Amino acid sequence: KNKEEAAEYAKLLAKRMKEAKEKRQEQIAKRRRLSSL
Amino acid sequence: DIQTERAYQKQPTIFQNKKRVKLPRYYKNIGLGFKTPKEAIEGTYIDKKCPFTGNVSIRGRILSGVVTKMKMQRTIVIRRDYLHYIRKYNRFEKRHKNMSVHLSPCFRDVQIGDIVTVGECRPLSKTVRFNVLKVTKAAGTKK
Amino acid sequence: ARGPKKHLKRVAAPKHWMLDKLTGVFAPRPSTGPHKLRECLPLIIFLRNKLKYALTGDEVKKICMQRFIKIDGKVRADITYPAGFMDVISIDKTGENFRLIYDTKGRFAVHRITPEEAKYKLCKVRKIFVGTKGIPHLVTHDARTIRYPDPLIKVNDTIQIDLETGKITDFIKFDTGNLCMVTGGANLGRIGVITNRERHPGSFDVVHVKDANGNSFATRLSNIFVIGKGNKPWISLPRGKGIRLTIAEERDKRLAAKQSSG
Amino acid sequence: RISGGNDKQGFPMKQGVLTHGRVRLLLSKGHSCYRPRRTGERKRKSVRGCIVDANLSVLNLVIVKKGEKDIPGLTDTTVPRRLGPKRASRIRKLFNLSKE
Amino acid sequence: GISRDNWHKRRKTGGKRKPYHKKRKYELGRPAANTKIGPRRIHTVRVRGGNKKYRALRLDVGNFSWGSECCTRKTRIIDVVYNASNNELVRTKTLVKNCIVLIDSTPYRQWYESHYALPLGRKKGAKLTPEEEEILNKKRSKKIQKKYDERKKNAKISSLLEEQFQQGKLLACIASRPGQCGRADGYVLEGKELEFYLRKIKARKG
RNA sequence: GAAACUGCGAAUGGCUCAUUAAAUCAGUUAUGGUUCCUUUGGUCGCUCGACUUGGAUAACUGUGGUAAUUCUAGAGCUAAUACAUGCCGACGGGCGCUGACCCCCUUCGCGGGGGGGAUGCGUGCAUUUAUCAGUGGUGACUCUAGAUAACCUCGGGCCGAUCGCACGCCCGGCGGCGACGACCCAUUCGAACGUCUGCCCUAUCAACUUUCGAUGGUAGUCGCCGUGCCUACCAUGGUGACCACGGGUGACGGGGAAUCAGGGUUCGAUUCCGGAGAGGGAGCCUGAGAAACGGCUACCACAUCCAAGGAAGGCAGCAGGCGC
């Protein structure tokens, strides 16, 4: 159960942090836009 | 100048004997939109009960009084004036409740008559339960 | 006293149990459990007084000690067990399913559901907590811990759990334009759409809610439970749908129905 | 061996008190001459000294090394055991059995 | 027994309180451990909530941390020097939190020597006949010497610590209450603290 | 299925109002300053090092002492989820240091660049201390996680020598559903200590407090934690005509009760919430919870039975009796 639960969450969070990293490149693309619109 | 008492006065958070090759200061913003003052960030005193640079957390009530006496050390007596409403006679009566309050050595030049805001924290002494967060100098005092 | 109390006098008992004065001296002191003592409904009161299957305490004991009653898909043979807000009472032999949700007034409704709806429930999160090795934990309103939640769920969101597995299916995020039931105060059982949240650093945050008929009412954020996205309830609502029509309207509806009935 | 007797008032002899006179002790649990009523109780019980004096009603003896003669009361008969070993290990220990 | 409550003493003004109830249990008071220096002795105390609290009555070893370079070793306490609270607690040599004690310098010396490839303590001229210390200070392979020479770059200890090591007793401050947890965990005094305490004991010396 | 050992409950309920005048109590808030039986939901091969062990006791048989009581000593036997001691498994390796030894390239070469790497030590949660960095949350942490160096109380933290119905699955092998237990976390029932405001009459009570703590400061001791709670050394403070300090109360406080045009006056021991007490004071045992009295230990007052040595007491529980 520990093995399956840790595995499933590690997939979910990797997806969530990639959604937040598609936001991080949006944070970089926010700054390049901020300076050079 | 500091470390007058027997034991060594220091901020327990920071380490001051790092092997190398000025002392950094522990301080915190205390929330509720109160400004962490400059003598707290820059100064060189040691105070357990300073709400900015010490081990005490402000929670519960925030009150205001006017400074009455400043004779006992790192502590002041403020005087809180209000009106109590008797119902038989549709009139008020002028009452007062003066309370003991911890003044940090941060607030350097405070005179009597100053409108001192205080915040409730853990019992500091027998009669002391509040701590000075800001000071407003009495009307004028420019000259 | 010198320890925890065990008796509850019939007068000092929570009022929404609607207990009479002349039956007895004591009321069923609810056993400790997931819900609070003033915000619960003991299994004895629900079973004997509302449904009126049992007539007395002995009959309630006899009905439940045959392992017949099942609160949240788990069998409970305890008469004073606190069945609270968002529970799925599942009497198996009659083939009925009840969900405890606040009536339009400050009381619990005898609300029958379908067996397809009686397989999940709608839990509010109370705190999000980091474990012993970076294992995130939820703690819901009914004292139920779930570890490895969604990394998005935060401290006032609603989650939908499966009742056997005890794991999150969906969640409704706390923001404007979401259906919320009020679970405390004078506005107890009002269903409305969130209009504005007003932050009070140090005090309790107050949330303004709008009803379905343009009736607007506030309540402190402690007493709010989001049960829907937009205007869409995620469970079945009781007759009235948490409106609270005025005593003037409730008088008119009562006697007008009586006139037409005969 | 002499295993303690009773005073002429009925007060039993308690080991390791070192008197011929009689004394009041606070007898808690883990003490002889007292069994408690409530769990976590102590009681003032008067007990007679452990040393033997001219003032005693009984002395309780146990024979250590059996002599040469047949005493008409005791050694004449032999007592059968009321019970036998219950624990599996105690049965194995007594009857001298292997594991298989 | 000993009551630990506010209602037995005068008000903010100076009026006398009349006790509205007799002594309660939770207002408890047990005698002071007054932990001494001898062979290990700890007694257990059942406290409120049915938890355990260890009374160190005698204690000679403690887990001290020379935390300049992050080296902590279990060490043998020898005697107490100075105490800020009271002066008779040094005469009747009792451990209390924030005491000043002397500790065995040998585990710290050993570590420093075996780490930095230099000697510590060891006064000038004294012959190192045992020569297992020889093998700890000499005989390195090829690139390990690159590691130990980029290490011993910043091997320089301060003078006031060198003095104590040469004698064989370091000054340390007890950071754990010995009466409550049944321990004597502390830290070695360094720099500003050490100068302050050496001065305070020399004013006590006269 | 008697008894008896074990676990649990006996701290709730019931009775009374003697104390008690910023005390109790009521409304409002705080614990980011704590403890928590039980209930409920989590955790319970995360630790690299036995097909079931140990020796007593009760009941029971037997022999007794005392004028005496829920008093008990001695003998012989026998259980455990009582009391103790302790494995194997998972387990094959990871992970941080330690570092023998080895191949490769740039410089003729020293030198310079990494790659592996025998061996030894260490490891998990909890406990205590010191140092370093900055997964999630708050108005605010010296928070919750993560890293490192150690420690581990022998009056001992955990890491199942326990019980019941089911009975199975292939060459002696071979799994569900429950009860009980257990460190830690949350939850519930709470308790405890603080915040702001509020009480009857009295000046024939005007000054009060303080080196035997009165108000602060530093360091500890004790405590479940915050604090003069208590020590040591400093400082001279704190309260008062806005009535302190002292005294009286035929005073437990409040929800409330009778009276009332409107104001108001008087009452509230009394069934619900809170407090206090078990003849008067003090001390403690066991337990998650008591300074417990239908628990114990004394001392004052009263008092019962005595074969004269000793022994047992506590109705402001329900009845009931004297006294008033």
Side-chain angles (χ1 to χ4, degrees), chain D residues 9-10 22 24 33 35 40 42 57 82 87 89-90:
Chain D
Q9 268 63 45
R22 193 208 305 158
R24 299 195 69 77
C33 312
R35 92 170 168 76
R42 307 182 288 182
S57 185
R82 184 59 158 77
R87 188 180 295 179
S89 187
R90 288 195 215 274

Side-chain angles (χ1 to χ4, degrees), chain C residues 1-7 9 11-12 25-26 29 32-37 74 76 81 127-134 137 139 142-145 147 154-155 201-202 204 220:
Chain C
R2 285 140 49 204
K5 302 206 171 198
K6 292 162 178 188
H7 298 79
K9 296 291 175 54
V11 199
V25 181
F26 304 97
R29 174 79 163 195
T32 49
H35 306 280
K36 301 195 75 71
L37 192 136
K74 207 78 206 299
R76 292 280 139 70
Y81 179 84
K127 68 202 301 161
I128 46 171
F129 168 53
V130 194
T132 193
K133 296 184 181 199
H137 290 79
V139 177
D142 69 299
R144 176 196 282 283
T145 319
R147 55 168 204 164
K154 269 215 291 183
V155 199
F204 320 98
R220 55 180 57 186

Side-chain angles (χ1 to χ4, degrees), chain C:
Chain C
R2 285 140 49 204
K5 302 206 171 198
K6 292 162 178 188
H7 298 79
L8 178 50
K9 296 291 175 54
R10 195 156 193 97
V11 199
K15 197 197 195 165
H16 59 246
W17 298 352
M18 291 169 282
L19 296 194
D20 75 302
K21 283 142 60 180
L22 272 68
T23 287
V25 181
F26 304 97
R29 174 79 163 195
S31 294
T32 49
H35 306 280
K36 301 195 75 71
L37 192 136
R38 292 317 206 88
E39 320 190 6
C40 70
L41 184 73
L43 192 53
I44 182 155
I45 282 167
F46 178 74
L47 198 69
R48 111 186 163 213
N49 280 126
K50 301 332 179 43
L51 301 189
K52 297 185 173 68
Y53 283 133
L55 283 183
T56 55
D58 281 350
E59 286 199 347
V60 167
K61 192 55 166 278
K62 282 204 170 99
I63 288 167
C64 71
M65 286 303 299
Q66 303 184 242
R67 311 198 57 75
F68 279 157
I69 318 171
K70 197 203 296 164
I71 304 175
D72 293 356
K74 207 78 206 299
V75 171
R76 292 280 139 70
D78 184 29
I79 60 163
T80 51
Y81 179 84
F85 186 64
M86 299 288 171
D87 276 344
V88 186
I89 296 181
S90 182
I91 293 173
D92 200 2
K93 198 162 175 196
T94 64
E96 300 167 319
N97 288 260
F98 307 89
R99 185 186 290 259
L100 293 108
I101 45 177
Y102 285 109
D103 189 19
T104 186
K105 299 180 173 294
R107 59 185 69 122
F108 279 107
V110 175
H111 184 270
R112 294 186 177 79
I113 65 180
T114 56
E116 295 84 34
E117 195 188 316
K119 279 190 285 174
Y120 70 93
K121 69 190 284 273
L122 210 62
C123 290
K124 161 181 177 169
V125 309
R126 288 291 191 83
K127 68 202 301 161
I128 46 171
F129 168 53
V130 194
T132 193
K133 296 184 181 199
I135 318 304
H137 290 79
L138 279 169
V139 177
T140 75
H141 75 123
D142 69 299
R144 176 196 282 283
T145 319
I146 311 174
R147 55 168 204 164
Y148 298 119
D150 204 59
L152 219 59
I153 296 162
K154 269 215 291 183
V155 199
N156 298 311
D157 289 21
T158 287
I159 72 183
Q160 182 185 322
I161 73 164
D162 203 325
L163 217 61
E164 307 96 52
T165 68
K167 280 158 191 141
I168 296 99
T169 301
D170 279 314
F171 65 100
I172 314 96
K173 203 112 199 192
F174 194 110
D175 209 332
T176 186
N178 287 321
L179 257 198
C180 71
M181 193 175 295
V182 187
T183 75
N187 298 303
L188 184 42
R190 299 276 274 286
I191 298 175
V193 185
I194 300 179
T195 316
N196 180 37
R197 184 183 155 174
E198 195 169 27
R199 311 306 197 77
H200 286 138
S203 317
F204 320 98
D205 296 12
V206 53
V207 173
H208 295 270
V209 173
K210 186 162 272 282
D211 213 322
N213 290 333
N215 305 309
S216 55
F217 55 91
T219 36
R220 55 180 57 186
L221 182 138
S222 303
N223 307 326
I224 273 178
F225 204 115
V226 305
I227 61 171
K229 262 214 71 184
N231 310 317
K232 308 309 195 305
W234 278 30
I235 49 161
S236 176
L237 304 184
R239 66 184 66 155
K241 285 87 76 172
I243 285 173
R244 247 179 63 186
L245 57 143
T246 321
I247 53 169
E249 302 199 325
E250 200 172 7
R251 176 266 309 276
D252 289 326
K253 290 202 177 203
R254 166 176 57 76
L255 68 81
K258 172 188 161 65
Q259 301 314 121
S260 184
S261 176

